[PDB]
Design a protein around this ligand. Structure first.
Ligand SMILES: CN(C)CCCN1c2ccccc2Sc2ccc(Cl)cc21
Length: 179
């Protein structure tokens, strides 16, 4: 395995410090995959921001996702399961449990999810940050991770924060949960 090139693609067991690190609000920035299904489906996502509340005693994360797709907001919450040893996270989408490797970069205000990382025919990365806009410093780290997987930068699908439809609903939820 080529290092430093692939340094950040390397899984490590998930600790409580790591769970704390990913706690809070995240914005989905960019992704790329060799999997063709994810290429056509992720292409429809205009924005997404979500909340992670990990439960360190249960190895779960409570997710509250706010996805913008088809000119509308789609809200869903669920309990993700954490597989500490394998450095992975899992959730149910469309009936089936799906797994993602939890990965990181130099900047702690960012994180990645790795999909099908064992399979060079299907692998991909999704890129997340604490703001909907990222710096060239932050981007560089993600683009490097794509270089590791030999995925062209041209294959990246990007969000556009101005197209978000979920902010007004998140606003409504804040009102409800703080009442
Ligand atoms: C292409 N996308 C369907 C996969 C993205 C990774 N996706 C995910 C997948 C499989 C298992 C766990 C997770 S955690 C997670 C939390 C927030 C968001 Cl927005 C996405 C994910």
């Amino acid at each position: 395995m080529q290092i430093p090139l692939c340094a950040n693609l390397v899984p490590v067991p998930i600790t409580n410090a790591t769970l704390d690190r990913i706690t809070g609000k995240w914005f989905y920035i960019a992704s790329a995959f060799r999997n063709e299904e994810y290429n056509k489906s992720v292409q429809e996502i205009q924005a997404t921001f979500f909340y992670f509340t990990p439960n360190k005693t249960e190895d779960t994360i409570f997710l509250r996702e706010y996805q913008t797709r088809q000119n509308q907001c789609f809200y869903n919450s669920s309990y993700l399961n954490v597989q500490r040893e394998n450095g992975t996270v899992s959730r149910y989408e469309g009936g089936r449990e799906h797994v993602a490797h939890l990965l990181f970069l130099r900047d702690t205000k960012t994180l990645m999810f790795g999909s099908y990382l064992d399979d060079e025919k299907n692998w991909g990365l999704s890129f997340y940050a604490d703001k909907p806009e990222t710096t060239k410093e932050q981007l560089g780290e993600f683009y490097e991770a794509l270089d590791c997987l030999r995925i062209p930068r041209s294959d990246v699908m990007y969000t556009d924060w101005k197209k978000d439809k979920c902010e007004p609903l998140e606003k409504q939820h804040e009102k409800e949960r703080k009442q």
